[PDB]
Design a protein around this nucleic acid. Structure first.
Length: 121
RNA sequence: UUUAUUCAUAUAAUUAAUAGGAUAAUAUUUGUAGUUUUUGAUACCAUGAUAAGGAUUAUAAAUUGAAAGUGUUAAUAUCAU
């Protein structure tokens, strides 16, 4: 659904909404923007299949297959959707020939518990 | 003669209520439950400030340093069920 990508926001009109805005947690904007966004679908598959974020994943996999770990990490910072499993496979396989264990463990732990277990592969 | 404030005459602004999200043994969920929502009692109480007069202690040349406590009359005045 490429047409219905987007989220509407509020206006903070009444006094109780102002009091709720002043009583909100430390992560209220990013949490509600993340949970109002992509989530596990009705049949159980991942929300990976995103149209607008599709060529960024191709660029990340293309840069992690040529050995460019830092550029793939830099365009991994630009992701909004849950990235596919092939991103984590390409990133970890880029981490193998340099023996970079800490970067591979961080790559796994980023998608392990935070991103619906996409790196648990 | 110009300007900081003051004053004149033109103005915009209006309402109400909560909602927990990774590493948690399974609820998909949140424009939903609210409508005739709250901002509505400045009074005649007997307050309190002002001025004025009293007494006690120093018999040491030491110490950085011989300084501190206790009582009465006039006028003015008193807007909270």
């Amino acid at each position: 659904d490429p047409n219905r990508v987007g989220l509407n926001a509020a206006t903070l009109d009444c006094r109780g909404r102002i009091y709720r805005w002043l009583r909100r947690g430390p992560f209220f904007q990013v949490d509600n923007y993340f949970r109002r966004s992509v989530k596990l679908n009705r049949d159980g598959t991942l929300p990976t299949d995103f149209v607008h974020e599709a060529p960024l994943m191709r660029k990340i996999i293309r840069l992690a297959h040529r050995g460019h770990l830092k550029a793939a990490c830099e365009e991994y910072r630009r992701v909004t959707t849950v990235p596919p499993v092939e991103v984590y496979r390409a990133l970890t396989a880029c981490c193998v020939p340099g023996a970079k264990l800490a970067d591979a463990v961080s790559i796994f732990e980023d998608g392990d518990s935070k991103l619906f277990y996409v790196s648990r592969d």
